[PDB]
């Protein structure tokens, strides 16, 4: 658990530092320096928007790959004694990849809303552009993380389904319903991302 120890140490140190820093800023009357407004505002909307698109695609692909390996290991292991698994349970892989297809679709939809400003002063950048960056970032987070979780869930369920099919052929047809239910979550994330970026306009 060396790497987990390192991560836990970093987390604890960072958040102890944050606690003491917040106590200092509040108590020493230096709160006006902790300008979250200035952070969110000076930080360019392009950073948020492009991080959002990148996350939308990358996390969707991460979930698709996670599920694909989770279920393909089981498919190939079971098929050593019952090769029909390879031909039948490719549907789990298909779902895990539909996750990434949703990811790219939403990356396209988000990227279609990008446009330069030609301004640097926040009053010039305006609510429209700032909210556009924030909402593209949020939509990317939504789609990417929902797709990641849906892909992992479908992969786990598909590994289970492949293992169960390796022993009795008539079970996969009934266990695919769990895969469908797990797939619905990616669709929900896509719908929410689309709603978020519905009225988004950079320029």
């Amino acid at each position: 658990t060396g790497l987990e120890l390192l991560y836990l140490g970093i987390f604890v140190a960072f958040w102890a530092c944050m606690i003491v820093v917040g106590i200092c800023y509040t108590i020493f009357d230096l709160g006006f320096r902790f300008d979250v407004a200035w952070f969110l505002t000076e930080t360019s909307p392009f950073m948020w928007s492009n991080l959002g698109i990148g996350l939308a695609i990358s996390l969707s692909v991460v979930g698709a790959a996670w599920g694909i390996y989770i279920t393909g290991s089981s498919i190939i292991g079971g098929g050593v004694k019952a090769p029909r698994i390879k031909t039948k349970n490719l549907v789990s892989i298909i779902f895990c990849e539909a996750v990434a297809i949703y990811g790219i679709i939403m990356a396209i939809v988000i990227s279609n809303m990008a446009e330069p400003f030609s301004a640097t002063d926040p009053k010039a950048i305006g609510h429209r552009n700032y909210h556009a960056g924030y909402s593209m970032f949020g939509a990317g987070l939504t789609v990417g993380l929902s797709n990641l979780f849906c892909g992992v869930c479908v992969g786990i369920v598909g590994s289970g389904a492949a293992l169960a099919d390796a022993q009795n052929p008539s079970l996969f047809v009934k266990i695919l319903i769990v895969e469908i239910f797990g797939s619905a979550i990616g669709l929900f994330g896509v719908i929410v991302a689309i709603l978020q970026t519905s009225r988004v306009k950079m320029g």
């Binding site: 539909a98 297809i101 319903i177 469908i180 797939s183 619905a184 669709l187």
Partner: peptide, 25 residues
Amino acid sequence: VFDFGDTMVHQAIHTIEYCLGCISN
């Protein structure tokens, strides 16, 4: 034997599958 509940569940699964499949395909 005819099981109405199971038939309804099967048709619901088929309809959900086809409708989500249109979009996903």
